[PDB]
Predict the structure.
Amino acid sequence: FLELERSSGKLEWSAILQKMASDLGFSKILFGLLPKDSQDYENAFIVGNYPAAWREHYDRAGYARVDPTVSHCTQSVLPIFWEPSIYQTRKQHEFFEEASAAGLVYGLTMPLHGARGELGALSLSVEAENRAEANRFMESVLPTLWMLKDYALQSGAGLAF
Amino acid sequence: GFLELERSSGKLEWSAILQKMASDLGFSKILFGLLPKDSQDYENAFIVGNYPAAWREHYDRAGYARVDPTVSHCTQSVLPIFWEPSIYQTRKQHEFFEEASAAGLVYGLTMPLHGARGELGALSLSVEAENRAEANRFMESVLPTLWMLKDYALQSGAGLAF
Ligand SMILES: O=C(CCCOc1cccc(Br)c1)N[C@H]1CCSC1=O
Ligand SMILES: O=C(CCCOc1cccc(Br)c1)N[C@H]1CCSC1=O
């Protein structure tokens, strides 16, 4: 994990994080971080390879207020798996279907809460033949991910702003 | 594998569960402490564990919160800090280490806690060992489990404290 700490710039750091995630077996990621006093977007540091059409769709639809992982991050330090049970409201149901259309189906989000009051998330999505396979995989690497998210948080917070 | 923590209904039951989890991982002494957002009110911090009472009192009276290198570390980082000679840098910190050792707190680590609602704290665990090579073997073997444990302890502890 030391390679993240030793990155000098955002481009280098992002490429290292993306490669680490890929080597682990996740094809898509989002790392997002806000400074302490900031609420919604605006000065958010966002990296990764989420589909650009999804990012724009999400913003226009005001999905920060719909996405169940966002509310979860505001109240918890524990991972939230993208299971059907988290998409409860009608808007969350459509959110799930639209995310799926954009290729985001199986995954998890690790909330990020930095020492300086940074608020964010490391989300990782996996391609799998089915949900059971995706969950077996995520469980198999969970302790590694749990360390990764804190290393990414500490190093990213130092570069983000 | 940490479900007992969240399900715990009271501070005494929760404390005992956490102490047993730490013991099972090889650590006979722990401190779990949490303060609310932007607070330095240690008098009203949520503190559990089994550090020697003589050490706690000494620490408080000497104002060691301002000397202990693990406290300043927690303020700036989410990463663990191992209790190694290299962390005791100032003259006062060398004295701190000597006294901490007189109280049996030579080997261990501190995991900083930063809660979703701004809580600040630490899960500290001390291990008994003959030397640091042995202590390191003991700690390295359970580090990934501790890393998850500290966050489960934070989430559940923050609910009970605040
Ligand atoms: O990755 C996410 C967002 C996770 C949370 O992101 C956050 C949360 C708080 C602050 C910031 Br910046 C980003 N959602 C996923 C769920 C399935 S589809 C999708 O976009
Ligand atoms: O366990 C600790 C203290 C860890 C940090 O504790 C904290 C930090 C922030 C808020 C609160 Br409450 C407690 N120190 C150890 C180092 C060796 S001897 C000793 O007491």
